[PDB]
Design a protein around this ligand. Structure first.
Ligand code: NA
Length: 371
């Protein structure tokens, strides 16, 4: 019912629309109820919107999985709850075996379906999380941006920031790379990008004085994080530019969540983030595959015991707000405010209609200066 957008730093977690996912190291990710997700996950990405059955045609949809044991009403109720805590719930488009192969002219229907779902479940936006085979499949590069622009405009008209994020695998983010049409077509529409810095093996970048810095090199983790992010935020070393304010670092929760890319020593991330902060380009947060893995089991049935949220939650939420933020100072008696000057007072935002001083928001009647 209420589009709830994030203007501050994010800790993003994917949520599995399936039970008992099998890990890379033989572990188990159970289905969990939304309201069970750790509250420091302030963006939760419902995975996935997909073609379940090609006989329904080319437009992906979302169907809550029965086996999670949650009525539709009940899942909507939990979204509402998240929204009441100021957290977002996005619908992730794509994933493995999504069968998304759209042809030119599909964008109208795709946008209609985006909107139908969004109004039905109360999603706050959409994560583009295509599998590799979809990135340039049929006309996806045209249809998906075209649809998402229409969706973004629809909700702008009605007061709302429908969030658009993306989860490109990082090697597709070279200048003029296969992902870059999504980035350029949705520039000024997208909120932030949370690339996957995992599942890409020896892919990496070369830095003089250091050598090849691979994504699966756990000994050079701080250098990897730092330089791959510095390249992206400056558009340098043959990477497409994603500004630091729109750049969230996507990681595996644990060694079961992905083949490679798990951060063994979280000090490697703190130190890289602090260097990026000290150079005036702090990152927007972190993302993880996945909340379900962060609550899941290893092969011996040992709980991962929410270690990823333990390691990054407070780190990121203790950061200074990014440029996106809406800072609204408390009302003050001796202050002169003017048309459009917002303040905070009694746990609510008030918006000055005209010249005022010494007039407390809430006492001003229904057609006084505070509104
Ligand atoms: Na919502």
């Amino acid at each position: 019912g209420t589009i709830t957008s994030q203007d501050d730093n994010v800790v993003v977690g994917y949520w599995h629309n399936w039970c008992d996912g099998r890990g890379y190291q033989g572990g188990n990710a159970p289905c969990v109820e939304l309201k069970t997700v750790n509250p420091q996950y302030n963006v939760v990405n419902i995975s996935f919107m997909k073609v379940y059955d090609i006989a329904e045609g080319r437009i992906p949809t979302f169907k809550l999985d029965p086996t999670i044991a949650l009525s539709e009403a009940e899942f909507i109720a939990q979204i509402d709850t998240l929204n009441s805590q100021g957290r977002s719930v996005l619908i992730a488009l794509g994933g493995a075996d999504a069968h998304i192969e759209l042809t030119r002219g599909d964008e109208d229907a795709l946008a209609a379906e985006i909107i139908r779902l969004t109004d039905l479940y109360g999603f706050d936006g959409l994560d583009i999380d295509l599998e590799q085979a979809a990135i340039t499949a049929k006309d996806n590069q045209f249809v998906i941006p075209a649809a998402l622009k229409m969706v973004k405009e629809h909700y702008r008209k009605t007061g709302d920031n429908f969030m658009i994020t993306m989860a490109p695998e990082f090697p597709y983010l070279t200048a003029n790379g296969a992902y870059t049409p999504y980035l350029t077509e949705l520039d000024g529409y997208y909120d932030f990008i949370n690339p996957q810095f995992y599942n890409q093996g020896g892919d990496g970048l070369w830095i003089e004085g250091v050598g090849w810095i691979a994504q699966n090199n756990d000994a050079l983790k701080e250098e990897f994080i730092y330089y791959i992010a510095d390249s992206l935020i400056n558009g340098t070393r043959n990477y497409h530019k994603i500004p630091h304010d729109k750049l969230v670092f996507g990681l595996p929760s644990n060694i079961d969540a992905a083949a490679t890319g798990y951060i063994q020593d979280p000090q490697d991330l703190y130190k890289a983030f602090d260097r990026l902060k000290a150079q005036g380009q702090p990152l927007r947060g972190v993302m993880t595959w996945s909340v379900n893995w962060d609550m899941g089991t290893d092969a011996a049935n040992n709980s991962y015991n929410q270690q990823f949220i333990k390691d990054y939650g407070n780190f990121i939420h203790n950061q200074l707000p990014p440029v996106t933020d809406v800072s609204d100072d408390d009302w003050q008696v001796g202050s002169t405010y003017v048309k459009d000057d917002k303040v905070t007072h009694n746990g609510a935002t008030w918006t000055a209609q005209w010249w005022t001083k010494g007039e407390e928001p809430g006492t001003t009647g229904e057609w006084g200066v505070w509104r």
